[PDB]
Each structure stands twice: as C-alpha cells, then as structure tokens.
Design a protein around this ligand. Structure first.
Ligand SMILES: O=C(O)c1cccnc1C(=O)O
Ligand SMILES: O=C(O)c1cccnc1C(=O)O
Ligand SMILES: O=C(O)c1cccnc1C(=O)O
Ligand SMILES: O=C(O)c1cccnc1C(=O)O
Ligand SMILES: O=C(O)c1cccnc1C(=O)O
Ligand SMILES: O=C(O)c1cccnc1C(=O)O
Lengths: 265, 265, 265, 265, 265, 265
C-alpha cells in the first residue's frame, strides 16, 4: 500500500498548503519579480541521514506552484548522505518558472525537514524497542504542533509507530477527574459509552490493580497504568515489559529536524 | 513595554486559536460530557527549567474556553523548578467549568511548551554569544513551522533574539539566482529597489570582496557572506567576528520543548 | 435551457463541496489506503422511482475527486426502476482510482438522494395541483436545511415549483409585527420601499379585506392571506381557489429521500 | 450528564451558526429595518408531538443575535401539544430588540424542527425495538445531510440511538472492494490495522460464515452481515435476532420534521 | 427608522471588519508595542463638508478593538467644518488602551472617508435632480468596489439614492445577448421568469418602441432604454424626462472621499 | 521584469477573486441560465485615456470563469482611445461559454477600471513631479480601500510611484504619541528597534530641527517633517524641495476610474 493514499484526493489539508504559501507572501514576492519566469531546473537535496517523509505535502506545494517534480526515492526511504562523496543526496528533480521554484522552496523544505525528523525519530524508537524483542507497539500523543496535527500523525505512521488517538473526538480517554466526577470508574465508563457507542474505544487511566479491574468490568477497551482489553504505559523514554502499548511524545515532539536544500542548475 | 502588545487586539491569530480547538474536536468532546460543568480550580505547572513564553496565546485559548486565569509570572521570566522541592512550579491558577478546563488543556500546553522551548533556546544562544563580548545580533530565519510563524517569531523576540525578516514580502533577499538573472548584482538590486521602494531593505548574499562592494554601490542595505550597510553571516552554530548579524535556525527550529502540565484541585 | 447553468462556473458552492469532503475525512482515509489507486469502473444506481436532481453538485464532488463520469440521464428525468427487471437503474458510469471513487461515494449519494427527493416531492405537488386545472403557482419557503439552501432551492426549481423568495435580502415580507411597528401597513410598506427600492418586491401578510387594500394602495407587490399585485395563500397541503401563489414547505422540508447506490465493477 | 456538553465551548460549530445567518442575509435585512430595535417579548412554540432537540444550536443562534432566552423544557423532553387545549406549547421565552428576534427566528426554527424530527424518529425506533426485549443497539449511518453531520449525529444521541461511526477517519469499514484489493480479508484487515492502530476499531462486511471467521481471526472488531467481536446487520427497517447492532438511515435520513413557531407578544 | 438596522446583528460583514484589521497587521503591531495600553482619550474629526456615513462599520472596528465610543452626530448628518472656526468637527469621542486606538484608526478612517464620500455624492445627485421637480428616482449600479459592495450600497441608501439591484441573483437584467439567445425578448423573459419566479423582477434593456412593447407583453417588470411596468435610462450624468429611474455609477464609483482624522488628547 | 510576477503563483489574492464572484452571485445566475453555454467571442474595450492596470487580477477572474483571453497590450501601457476613430480600444479578445463571459464581465471590469484609475493618477503625479527635475520619489499611504490593499498598492507601482510602507507590520512609523509614551524620541525609537530589529526601517515624524536630529541619533531610518537617513514630507498635492519622499493619498484614494466595457460579437 501507499501511505500518501491516507490523504483524501481533496480536503482541508490542501487548503493548509495554500495558507502556508500566503503566510510567506502577505503582499508581494519581490524576489520572484527580479528572477522572472524563465524555465529552470532544480535538485532537492537531503543533507542529513534520516527517513524521507512529507512527500505528498511537499508535492502539493510544488503542484500549487505549478512545477514538475520527479522524486528519486519512495517516501519512507532511509537516506544516508553519510558518504559525503558529496555530503548530500538528490531526492527530487524540479522544473518550472524561476520565480515559482523559489516561492515553493522554503515552505516545501520546512515541511520535509520537520516531517522527516518526526519519521526518523519515530523509526528510531520503534526499531530500537523492537530489537529487544518487544512485540507490543510504540505510540504517540496529542502533544502535537498546533495546526500541524495531520502532518505529524502522518509522519508517525511512516516512521513505523502508532499514532495513538487522533483527537478528543476519537477514542475516549478517562482520568481520575472524570471518574469521581460521576462516582466511580464504572459510571465514568458507562457515561462515556453512552455517548461514544460501540464504534469507539474507551481508555481509562488507572494507578492500581483493583482500579484496572473495575474498568475492565465496566467495559473499558484500554487501561493506562502510566509511569478484550489492552494495556498501556505512558511516558517511558529509556523498561519494556509485556504491556501492549508504550506512549511517548518523544517520537514527534521536540525532535531534531532533517536538513534539506534546493538549488537551481 | 509589553511583548504581548505586538499582537493586535484582534486579527487572524485569534482565529488560529479557534482552529486549533477545532483541530482537537472535529465532532464531540466525549470527556467533557462525562466530566460536566461544575466549577473547578486548576494549577498550570512548569516542569522544566526554561523561559516562559506564549502567554498571550495560551490566554486566548483560556479566554475562548471561558475560564478565569491568573498568571503568577510575567512572560519572559526564567523558571527553575530546579529545586524539586517539588520539581515543578505553578505559573497560573485557572477556574471554570470542569469540561472547559480539560478542553483548553492540551492545546494551551502545546503552545506553552513549544513557545517556551523556542524562547529558551533563543535566549541561550544570545546570552551565550553575548558573554563573549559580542555586540552584534543573533537572528532567526524563515525555516519556521508551517502555519505557526507568528508564534515562533514572537518567541524569538521574547528570547532576546532578532526575528530576522518575517517573510518574502518583507526585506528583499537576493542571491546568485536573481543576480545573473538580470545581468549583475547591480541590476538585481536595482529591480528589487524598483518594486520594494525606500520603505524596505534589500539584502544580497555574496561570497567575495568585489561582490559585496558592487552590492554596496548598488544600494543594498545588508550583505550576507554566508559560512549605510550591515554585514551578516549565516549558518553559524558554535567564530564570532565583528559582523553585525549571525543567522541560525538553531534558536527556533528543531529545538527541545519545555514541559508543562495542568491539574485540577 | 439548462438548470445547472444557474450555478456560477465558480463561487462558494464549489467550496461547499470541498467542505463536505472535509466533513467526511477530518484526518485520514483508512479505506482509501487499503484499496489503492488502481483504476476502476463503477455504476451509479437509482433504486427508487423519482426525479433525478443534484447532478451538477454530485459532478463537482466527482470532479474534485478526479474521476471521469458519464451521466446516462439528463437532470430532471423521471426514473422508474419500477420494473425490477433488476430493481434499479444505472444513471452514471464512473472511472478513476479505486480510493477516489470510494471517497466521493457517500457524499455524492447524500446529495443525489436528498436533491432528488426534494425535486420529486416538488414535482408531485405541482403536477397534482396542475391536474385540477389550477393555473397559479406552487412555491416553497425559507424553512430550508441550514447551510443547504442553494441546493434545496435549486431542487425546487428542477421539480417544476417556484422557489419563492431566496432569503431576507430578497423580496421584503412584512407582517403585523412590522405593521404596527410603524403605525400602519402604509408606513411599514413605505419604510420597506424606502430601503429596498424599485428592484425588489414587497409582500404584506394580511388577514382581512381592508388590510389587503391598504397594502395595495401603499405599493405592496404581493399580499399573503395565509390559511399590479398578486395574491398568495400559505400553508395549504391538501382548496385551490384562483389565488396566484400557494406556499408550502411540503415540497422541500421533511421529504422522503430517493435511494441511490454506487458499485465498482 | 448533559448532552450539550458534547459540544466544545468553542469550535467550528459556532462558526456554522454564523454562516447560517449569513446564508439568510447576504446583503441587508429590510424587515429588521422596518421593525426596529424596541425590546420585545416572544414565545417559542412547539406545534407537534415529539422530542425536543437542537437546543444548544438554537441557543447559539439566539446568543449571536444578542437575545435573552429561558427554556421551559430540558433537551430530550417529549412534548405533547397533543392536548390543543391550545394545540401548542411554549418551550422558551425570548427577549431582545425586535429586529434581532425576527432575524434569529427562521434559522433557529429550522434547526429545532429538523433536530427534533431526527431525535423523535431515533427514539421511536429504539423504544420500539426495545419493547420487543431486544438488548442490542440501533445505530445510524453516514448518510447524513451534507454540512449538517454534527447536528444530526448529536440528534441521534439525544433520541437514544447509537451514532455509529462518525466519518471515514473513525472506525475503519472494509468491504469486498478492499478485501480482494489486497488478496484476502486478512490482508485488508492487516493493512487497515497497519494505519489505524489500536485506538480505532476495524469493521468488515461479510456475507457468509467462513468470511466472518477469517475476519475475526484477522483482528476485526466488528462484522457486518448486511441484510472480542460484535455483530451488525444493516438496512433493517421492520427481524430482531440477537445481533449486537442494527444499522438504519431511517432514524435520521428523510425523516418528518417537528413544527415549531415563534411569536412576539 | 435606523439605516444601521439593515445590517444583521451578526453575519459576514463583521468578519469583513476582522479581515480588514488582519490586512493591516499580518504579523506584529510594532507601534502598539511602543505606545502601550494606558487608557487614552481621542476625538474623531471630520475635516471636509459632506454627509456622515459608515458609522456602523467604523463602530464594529472600534468594538473589535475594544474601545468606548460616543458619536456626536447621527449617521446621515451633513457636516460643515466649513466654518474653520477650527476647520474640523469632532464627530466622536473615543476611549481605550493607547495601542487599541492607534490600531483601529486607519481602518476606521478608511471606512468613514469612503462611505461618506459615496453618501455625499449620492445625496448631491438626488437633491440636485430633485430640485428640478423630478419625482422619479436616481439609482446606482453593479460597478462597485470588489469586496466592498455591502458598504457602498449601504452608503448609496444613506445618501438618499436607490441602490438598484444588489447583484446577479437579484432582479434579472436581460440584454440583446440573452434576447436572440432564445429567439426573442419574449423567450428570454419567459426563461428568466421560469427560474426567478414571481418573487423577483425582470428588467429588459431595449432600444426601440416595439422592443419595449414586446417586453411588456412578455411580462417584464422594468424596461431600460439606455442613453405594471417602470422605465429606466442608464448613463446619464448631466435630461430629466418623466422616466421612473435614472441609473449612474456616478453616485458611488470614482467619487471623492471625505477627509477624517483621529487624535489622542 | 514583469510586474505581475510580484503576485505569488498561488496565495490569498486568488481566493479574493473567488470571493468577488460569490459577492456577485449569492444564489443563482438567472442571466447565465437564459443565455446558455454556446461558445462566444468578446472584445474588452478601454473607453478612456489612461494607463492599463489590473491585468493579472482580471485574468484570474477570466481563468476561474474558464475563458480564453488574449491581451492586445502589455500592462502599464498608456491607451488613448483619444482618437474616437471609434472612441475606444480593444485591449483583449475573449472566448468561452456565453454564460461564463457575462459572469466574469462586471467583476473583471470593476477591477480594471479601478486599478487603471489608480495607476493613471499615480503616473500623472510622478511624471508631473518629475518634469520639474525632481529626483526624489512620490509615495502612497495606508489610506487604501478596505480589503483591496494588495490591488491598489500593486497599481501604485505600475503607475511608477512608490507604495510606501505596506502595513503596520512593515516599516515602523512613530509619532508624538509613541514618543512621549516612552519619554523621548530616543526611547520610542529604541523600543521600536527592540522589536522590529535590523530587517525593518523605523520612521519618525518630527516638526522641528532638534527633534529630527535626536531621531537620527537614535537610529531612525526616515524622518517625516509633514506639511544613513532619508527625509519625507507628507500631504503635498500641488513645493518640491530636495526632500527624498513626498507622500500623498492622491495617487490612490478618491481617484477617477478608467472606463472599460465588454461586448460579445
Ligand atoms: O491525549 C492523548 O491522546 C494522549 C495519549 C497518550 C499519552 N498522552 C496523551 C496526551 O496527549 O496527553
Ligand atoms: O529567508 C530568510 O529570511 C533567511 C534569513 C537568514 C538565513 N536564512 C534564511 C532562510 O530562510 O533560508
Ligand atoms: O419567509 C419566507 O420566505 C416564507 C414564504 C412563504 C411562506 N413561508 C415563509 C417562511 O419561511 O416562513
Ligand atoms: O458508512 C457508514 O458509517 C455506515 C454504517 C452502517 C451502515 N451504513 C453506512 C453507510 O454510510 O453506508
Ligand atoms: O448590472 C446592474 O445592476 C446595472 C444596473 C444599471 C446600470 N448598470 C448596471 C451595471 O452594473 O452595468
Ligand atoms: O501610515 C502610513 O503608511 C502613511 C505613510 C505616509 C503618509 N500617511 C500614512 C497614513 O496612512 O496615514
């Protein structure tokens, strides 16, 4: 299958791209005026070892800037301009009006560098906590960048990690707050089920044995223990027991970026 | 003066906040339904040493969620839950309907953690390259997070760094591409000036002495040398000559985040 | 003429379609990922006797999903999968990437089923109150579905009914409230005329003879009697006098839908 | 608990309300000009037996129109202006500028009538298929009105029915198309799981015994048979076996509306 | 009555105001930062003889900038800082944070100056072509400023002129193009009526006697002769016969502006 | 170079065009329905002496209306249908469906007439104050039409004038208000510099010699005297000293329009 197929042929994400362009050009593009529309050739370079990600997003930028691109690598590929036989690697060839190329450049690179960084960190962590023989899964969180959740979750997936719940409208996640708000884990879970129904899972964060057990009997689908049913521990950075899920914002939040660059022939 | 005064009482940034809420709740807030509207008290905790930033943005989230907040620290303050007399520090007191608090929580914390992280890195770098006795300035770049430029530039400022140019509609930045596109640095600069006028500066990236010098005579306001007029070097991470500006995406891109948390009494 | 020509080649209605897609895919299209982009063939089936409507809207969905469609029937056609020689009727042939077809499907069918239902009810009512020899017109109301007024009014037209006034900015409709608000029907009508001018008609709802008559002398273009000038009665469902207009939300509000389906070869 | 708490204090749904107002007043409100701003009193009447629904939405309309409202009944209440001791029932008291009341009126009533209709049909069906002693659940579909999904799903809930899956980004629903697209139910389910992860359920539509059984072994959470795991039958209108879920668009699509009205004192 | 009552308490026009603010502050308001939030007093001055218009729009700007304003003159008032006992006239008193006042200033004044200019020209023309004893009406056109139609039409009204048709969805206006497109004025008018219905008027532009007459018999509501039924001539700037309407873009297009200013105490 | 290259291949300005179309067709295009889609030919005529401007904007309208256009003159060309060998001049040839041409017409002409008017006035003023031998520049202001700033600034440029500062986020412009708000011009300028940095110029309005001089020493880039550093006088309409900049809203605000028309063959 193809990850980019997760993105609907059309939807709000394409308008996100348009807005990112507008964010860069509130009025006029002075540089585009001085450079002109002569057709030009350009290479997109990857200048740091890491996994390529964000291809469909960068491509949408290129599409809206009316350029012709040819990717030399499939998304998800691990690149290693490690050699520095030049120190970098051409991952795409671009053609189009000079101004159009220089306009798409920074926005496109801002997407690739950040999406690749998340993917790279996600992959490092799962493969790492694979190599121990762990069979469970490593998941993300909701601690995403404001306005950039679709892109970052998508990058988690390409990295080989679980996204965990997309938002607050997806899997219900109950805590102590909700628990004694209704009287007991049972009530909290029953009221959650009363509105989410069968199509969506309910997860309850516990801290003891009994607590977990009443949640199970209440109908909870997941139980978070935190630092018929699945088990999850959250926070854990460097431990692997035989829990089903380990959640950590480490694969997506505050991660290093993968450097890219673009140059006209 | 007050940094938050840079933000217009009303504009698109407030709609950005609304959209960040919508990004978290596409349909229903199941948890808000189970917890209810009973008034509750909550403390916002800073769990890592660093500079507080993003206050006006987090406050807008709280405002739209109809809550009452009292900040215990001015924005720009360096916090040091270093002590772990508890390991954390209450930076704000919040009151309002249970559901409203839990709805604002993740979005508000996603803003603070990232804005504080950028501020903290920005401050570390300038103060560092201060301590050497350098009198010039440290600036950022355009390698910002897509859709989050206002917030990140704002954080650079609070950190004590220069934002550098906001976008492509602000200071013109000419390169080799534009240069031989018109015939010479002089032409590129003349065509740029022809459209940007007197109100906006023109910066030309050079690589030699003469080049710099023709740019100066052409009317360039800044000259980038890269790895009446000002001088700037770009890339430099760990060197301080007596240049006027040192640009590096290090103070804002791929920076660690500062951990925060929120808990109901 | 062609009804779909009422829709401007470009305007907000096309953005409505985009938003309907986003409403169905807030994050990822998991099914589109599992099915892939292989080209596929598909038939759009009409599974209930009724008039075909909403063609230009369904087509916009197909266009944005980048598919190739061929309609086998003109909009406004009465279909009668009455036969159940199969029980259904292929009204369109579609081709395109598997994922793209399944993405457009539900949204496209939600449009056709509802637009056809309105058209079908509208047609049934006018033709019915035709067959009596009535020469006047049957009109709709403003009791449309929130956010879907353009589509429903358009469907009323295809059905052979009058839309009546599109909104509150179109024909002025005065009631008792406005009447004694100024002192008399004459004043209400004079103040309405004072702002709407000659380009827009003024309608006054009366309940007696004199009332109607003062409205006529005041300059009213239409007089509603309700359960140089035209006459209208509103509410009436099952009566036909020689009034000019009979208004009823029955041709568009709370009407049955016409079932459609889509299947890949 | 309170159903309206499912709605986030702020999000896109409130902007939906604003747009519904704009849809009614593209330019000027001639009637509002003739009536004026004098404070007025108004009663909201329910003129048909059915369940009250859409309260938070109608209230948002009233809020944006700056009016004061007092609801005489809790949402979810079954009303029976059956008596026609007057034939109707005051469900809310409104106060505010004349023009503001008449502006909110049609939009507010268009919401109540349709939301109550859906709720009423939903309730009739579950209670009905309750009375047989059926312990399973009755669910809706994705055949919602374009642009009005949040409101209609919300109404399904108030009616006492399950919403079923909200959209295509929520529970994965695999069919034959996806099945042989990968080679087997097992593959389809494995690829779906590969992208949706543990937080979201996977449902597979089958037509035989074995098929169901391979889906179960593949990891499917639900199995649709259509006309550890749950079972669902879809289409069924008037049959109740001991399946877990019965899906039908009947509780929300093409349902009669509940008539309301508003009158100034 | 009050003209500002034509504007719905809430709708897109208020979002237009927000966007006008964003158009002025894409990133930061440097001046607002240097001036601060200290409360200040300010007078809004009218520096040129003309009619005051655009009050509700300027007020919305002030409202969104959270200021307190007191208008010293009703909208529609003719001002004559003719005296230059100072040369200007305080039309409003404003109070609020320094930064908030200076932010609203230019946008608010850009609205008043242009709306007053249109009103002033509109009034000059009708009063002028009043003074001749003409009893007909002077109307505008569709040659409005892109994106500013609501404001300019509204200003035409305050000036004492007819707006003429608001847009292409309001009164149908047929020309030769449409006429021979169907075969004859009769056909064009019949097809127009077939879609616009009774609620909207149809206007046909003629150039001869017979032409006018067939339009009348076809059902046209207005007949334009251009350089039961009404008559209109379009273009005419400096002629008054006993036609009903004289259309000219002169009252709104390319009109001088009325100068205003704002100063802090 | 080409002025239209200042506009980004894609951004908000293209959405502005879409909205201008929606502003003209809130519901249906009755005329487009009566005229049909038959291909037609059309000439765009310039009926008044002046400079052609707004070409890229009018072209976007034509593009969205799916038409084929051929401009007979480069933007910036001075036209002189002075001859009235016919009285007008074909500046563009258009082809496409009848309805599509008539839909784009008014919006396209509203853009050309106003953009050309601004350009024409801008050119008249600079060339005029050229002919005196003045070597400085003539600039505009921020007194632009709400929502139409990009278009009007762009027109100023084509006219041969300086735009002056685009908005409040571009060059800082300090006044007395800001000056004594901090204690002195020096403080105001220092606080402005503290937030705008090196990339953006600071302008201070003075009224005396010393004042100018302290601003210069404070670091101001421009000094406005009003009715290393540059000098500017603002207001001046009919005086030319050897100042660097003369600002006047006369080249863009309240300027006459250049009449255009469109006719089908
Ligand atoms: O909310 C979540 O989805 C989540 C899931 C696992 C761990 N943390 C979180 C969080 O965002 O705090
Ligand atoms: O473009 C800029 O503003 C910029 C300024 C200095 C260094 N880098 C950049 C960049 O974004 O590549
Ligand atoms: O308002 C209208 O257009 C209308 C016209 C006829 C009958 N009812 C209505 C209504 O919406 O209540
Ligand atoms: O897609 C769904 O969610 C759905 C669920 C059950 C029955 N039908 C459908 C449908 O929309 O066709
Ligand atoms: O179209 C109109 O409404 C109109 C009405 C009268 C005169 N001109 C026009 C025009 O815009 O060309
Ligand atoms: O604000 C400006 O940019 C400006 C610049 C020069 C003269 N006036 C102004 C103004 O808008 O009042």
């Amino acid at each position: 299958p193809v990850y980019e197929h997760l993105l609907p042929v059309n939807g709000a994400w394409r308008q996100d791209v348009t807005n990112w362009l507008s964010e860069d050009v509130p009025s006029f593009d002075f540089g585009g005026y001085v450079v002109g529309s002569d057709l030009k050739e350009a290479n997109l370079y990857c200048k740091q070892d890491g996994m390529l990600c964000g291809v469909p997003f960068a491509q949408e930028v290129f599409n809206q800037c009316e350029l012709q691109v040819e990717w030399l690598f499939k998304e998800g590929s691990f690149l290693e301009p490690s050699k520095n036989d030049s120190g970098k690697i051409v991952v795409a060839k671009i053609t189009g009006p000079a101004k159009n190329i220089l306009l798409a450049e920074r926005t496109a690179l801002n997407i690739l560098s950040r999406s690749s960084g998340i993917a790279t960190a996600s992959h490092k962590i799962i493969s790492l906590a694979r190599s121990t023989g762990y069979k469970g899964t490593i998941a993300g969180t909701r601690k995403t960048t404001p306005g950039l959740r679709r892109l970052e979750k998508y990058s988690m997936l390409v990295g080989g990690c679980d996204t965990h719940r997309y938002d607050l409208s997806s899997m219900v996640m109950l805590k102590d707050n909700h628990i004694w708000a209704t009287g007991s884990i049972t009530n909290a879970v029953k009221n959650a089920r009363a509105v989410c129904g069968f199509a969506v899972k309910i997860e309850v964060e516990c801290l003891s044995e009994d607590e977990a057990t009443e949640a199970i009997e209440a109908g909870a689908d997941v139980i978070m223990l935190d630092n018929h049913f699945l088990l999850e521990c959250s926070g854990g950075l460097n431990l692997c027991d035989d829990i089903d899920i380990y959640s950590t914002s480490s694969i997506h939040q505050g991660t290093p970026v993968i450097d890219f660059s673009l140059k006209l022939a």
